Structures are given as C-alpha cells and as structure tokens.
Amino acid sequence: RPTFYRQELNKTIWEVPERYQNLSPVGSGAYGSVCAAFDTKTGHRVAVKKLSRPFQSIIHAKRTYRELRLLKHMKHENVIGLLDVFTPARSLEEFNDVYLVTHLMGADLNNIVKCKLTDDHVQFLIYQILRGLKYIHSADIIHRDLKPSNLAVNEDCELKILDFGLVATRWYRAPEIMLNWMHYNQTVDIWSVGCIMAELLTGRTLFPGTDHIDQLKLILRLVGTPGAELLKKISSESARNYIQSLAQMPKMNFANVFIGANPLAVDLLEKMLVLDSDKRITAAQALAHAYFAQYHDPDDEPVADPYDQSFESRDLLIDEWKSLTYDEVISFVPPP
C-alpha cells in the first residue's frame, strides 16, 4: 500500500496516493468531479475522477460497480481506459470513496467553433470513433449517449470515447429512444455518430430540437416519415398513432443538404441516418466505407474480450454492490 495526502479542492476534499501530485481541478458534474494531475510514476499528465456519492443508494451503488467493471474491461486506444483505481480506505468497513485515473485529454469535440473542421480532419475523427465503437459493440456494450462532449481529443487529434456508461444529449439521440422502445440495438450509436459527423462538416447541429416532439419533427424533415416497411416493425401503438397522424414528409436528397461536402461523406451519412435501425450501417461496415480509404486497416481494428453484463439484471442490497465494487478495486491489475 502507498501513502496518501489530503487537500480541499474547492468544496470537495480529496485523498490520493502521493504518486499523484499537482492536482488542479478541471470542472464538475453530478456523478463525480475531476482533477488534472501529474503522475510521478510515468511522467504523464493524468485525469483523476472522485465519484460523488458512490454508495449513497442502491442505484448509485449499482452504477459505481457498472462504471468500474466497464472501465476495467476496456483496452483500446480509442476508448478511455483505466490507469488506476484506488480508495483511501484500508478496509471494506471504512470503504466509501472511489477514484479512477486515466490519461489526460486536452479537449472535447463540443468546442469546434474553429478547429468548423476540414474534411481531412472529419475523416480521422469519425474513423477513430467508429474504431472504438466497433470494439465496444463487439462485447455487446452500447454507449447510448454519444455526443461531442463525450469525445475527447488531444492536439495531435488522437481521440477517445469517454464513458459508455449509466438538449445537449437530445440532439444526437436516435429517434427510436425518444418515442419509447426498450429494445434498441447498437446502431442507436451509429445515428449519433452520423449527427456528430454532420456537425463537424457543417459547424451546426443537424437536429437542434426543443423537445422530444420538435426533435422528431426535425428528423423526419430530413429522412422522411417512415414507410409501410418501418411501420410494419413498430410494436408500440401510441408511437404508430403519432407517426401516422403526421403530414407525410419526403426523404430529402443528402447530396443537397450537405452541399459541397465530400460526396463520399455524404453517402456514409446517408447509410448512417436511416430511420430504420435494422438497415443502418454498423461500426465494422462503416470503417470499410470508401470515406476511410486512408485510415482503414483490418489488421488493426480489433474486437474485445467477452464481457459479462449479467450483473445488470440483479437486485442487490446497497452493501452487496459495495462489496462487489471493493472486490473490483482490490483485484485491479494495472497496464504496462
């Protein structure tokens, strides 16, 4: 065991190993907060996240466990990974705080007012999203909320997906999680990628809706109302009532919506922005598309080990999720 020290970082206090010096807080959120930090052991800047109230309840306790299990499993260069996880507590008894550490990234994509992006750049960014999405999808994990702010980049344009886990969110959401389903597949994420890609190429949100009705309207004005083939597949009755009650809208030409874009990007966008999930291009398919000629290499677009999500259907006591989380901390094996 190593030695720790205690400081107060602006309300939140923090106890970390002396391995990490130079804690400068980088911002905040409802699930934890982060310090930028210098890691004496490797030279690299790293990012440290203390969970808010990891075991305050059964839902917080189960979510802490999910995040940690999810982070221990991811080993891929386009997906954020676990350098370290630690708690101050020397026993399960005293165990109440969890911290996670990964490499520090310098910016998120949601800042692209200027560097709007060039085509070279769109290609490399989306390519790497698709690459990480392939790996994630391959172990049956779905992100569910991919958006500019969930995608981190360094200055060399190395990209990582942040957590596949748990109005900004609204704008990138597949229209099939909006009108209520509870079976939607991996391709919900390909929709978001399409939406992100639109925006980088254009500088504006393709679908800036004000609510789940308006968002839907924005969407159908581009892809059009569902036809009898997609109506065929809607189990939900209120969904079918709503959509059939709308003035029919035509499928637009994408070549004319994204006018002057690499027409190759346009074709991809067309295969990603399909209303019908079963027909939307996948991550693997999407990386073999001609837009990515320059970056595509099938000897280095790997899949992930089997990942066991059976915990997810489990209903446990707060202290059972807590002990399970502790086991995951205790058994953590770092990387080289």
Ligand SMILES: COc1ccc(N(C(=O)NCc2ccccc2Cl)c2ccnc(N[C@@H](C)C(C)(C)O)n2)cc1
């Ligand atoms: C494995 O454990 C980690 C450790 C930290 C992070 N992490 C992060 O959560 N940032 C988003 C965020 C969420 C809630 C409150 C504050 C912030 Cl900045 C990171 C990770 C790497 N780099 C950043 N950079 C920050 C400055 C960002 C995403 C805003 O560019 N954040 C991810 C997982």
